[PDB]
Amino acid sequence: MTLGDLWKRRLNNCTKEEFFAYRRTGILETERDKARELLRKGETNMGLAVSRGTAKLAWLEERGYVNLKGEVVDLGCGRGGWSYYAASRPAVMGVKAYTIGGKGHEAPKMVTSLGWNLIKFRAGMDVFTMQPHRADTVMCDIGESSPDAAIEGERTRKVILLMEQWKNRNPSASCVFKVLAPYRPEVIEALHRFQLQWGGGLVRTPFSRNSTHEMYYSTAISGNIVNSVNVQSRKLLARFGDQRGPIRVPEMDLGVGTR
Ligand SMILES: Nc1nc2c(ncn2[C@@H]2O[C@H](COP(=O)(O)OP(=O)(O)OP(=O)(O)O)[C@@H](O)[C@H]2O)c(=O)[nH]1
Ligand SMILES: C[S@@+](CC[C@H](N)C(=O)[O-])C[C@H]1O[C@@H](n2cnc3c(N)ncnc32)[C@H](O)[C@@H]1O
Numbered sequence: 608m609t610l611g612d613l614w615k616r617r618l619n620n621c622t623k624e625e626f627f628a629y630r631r632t633g634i635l636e637t638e639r640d641k642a643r644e645l646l647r648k649g650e651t652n653m654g655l656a657v658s659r660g661t662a663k664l665a666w667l668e669e670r671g672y673v674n675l676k677g678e679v680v681d682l683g684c685g686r687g688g689w690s691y692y693a694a695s696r697p698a699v700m701g702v703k704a705y706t707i708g709g710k711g712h713e714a715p716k717m718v719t720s721l722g723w724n725l726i727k728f729r730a731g732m733d734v735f736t737m738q739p740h741r742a743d744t745v746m747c748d749i750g751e752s753s754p755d756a757a758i759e760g761e762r763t764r765k766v767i768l769l770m771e772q773w774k775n776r777n778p779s780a781s782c783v784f785k786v787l788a789p790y791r792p793e794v795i796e797a798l799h800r801f802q803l804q805w806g807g808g809l810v811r812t813p814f815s816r817n818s819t820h821e822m823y824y825s826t827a828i829s830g831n832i833v834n835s836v837n838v839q840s841r842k843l844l845a846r847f848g849d850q851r852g853p854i855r856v857p858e859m860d861l862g863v864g865t866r
């Protein structure tokens with residue numbers, strides 16, 4: 608059992624009040640009041656983030672932790688927050704975005720955020736059924752939380768394997784992907800082998816709730832994986848009992864227009 612495995616167990620043994628107190632204490636949270644209102648009105652002419660995923664990728668890019676460039680693929684794009692962010696970036700030439708949900712909350716949201724015209728959204732697609740094609744940047748934000756740590760670990764290994772397949776197709780592609788359960792030994796071993804073939808490292812974004820151990824792997828950074836993970840498991844464990852609330856910050860506005 609790792610530090611992260613104990614974090615999972617303490618999280619599962621929270622009452623409902625304790626869970627809600629814990630999940631957002633000390634994290635950054637974008638104020639989505641205007642974004643949510645426009646989305647629920649059906650306004651399409653807006654650059655505000657279509658999801659909270661947009662600020663996570665923005666944070667990684669503004670820190671210099673990812674290279675978003677060329678032909679971009681978004682594997683598991685959901686509402687499209689990463690797709691829209693990427694399509695707004697200068698070095699990005701096009702985005703092919705794929706997601707399984709065909710309608711509802713997790714289908715792509717269609718807005719005029721800057722560079723929207725460079726995005727091709729393919730809903731109803733399972734990316735594990737897809738043969739990799741050419742890409743300069745591969746992004747993947749897939750990994751569904753589960754109370755079972757072993758299930759989180761396997762979901763994470765499936766994403767690492769998918770990234771290996773796209774990297775075999777595109778050996779010099781920049782990669783950025785969610786690592787849902789980096790605390791599992793089987794994930795660390797798969798991720799260390801990825802790191803030893805392709806380079807890269809693991810980071811925690813400050814917008815991630817404490818109710819998930821997710822970290823983001825990028826080929827553009829470096830650092831010891833086990834040390835990065837241990838630091839974050841310790842922090843997640845420390846935050847149990849922490850009573851500071853979330854820290855509200857402005858939501859991303861990428862502006863509107865074609866590129
Ligand atoms: N103790 C406790 N743990 C929970 C509860 N709900 C979820 N969890 C745990 O916390 C994890 C996070 O699940 P999520 O629902 O994705 O967390 P969230 O921060 O609420 O985000 P949303 O799903 O968007 O609402 C789950 O895998 C469980 O391990 C709960 O009601 N009580
Ligand atoms: C965490 S969301 C990504 C959000 C996105 N980065 C954003 O900023 O809005 C991950 C998405 O992947 C989708 N997904 C999970 N498994 C998938 C699969 N096998 N194929 C395609 N999409 C998948 C889920 O429906 C979910 O909408």
Ligand SMILES: [Mn+2]
Nearest residue numbers: 626630752818
């Ligand atoms: Mn929940």
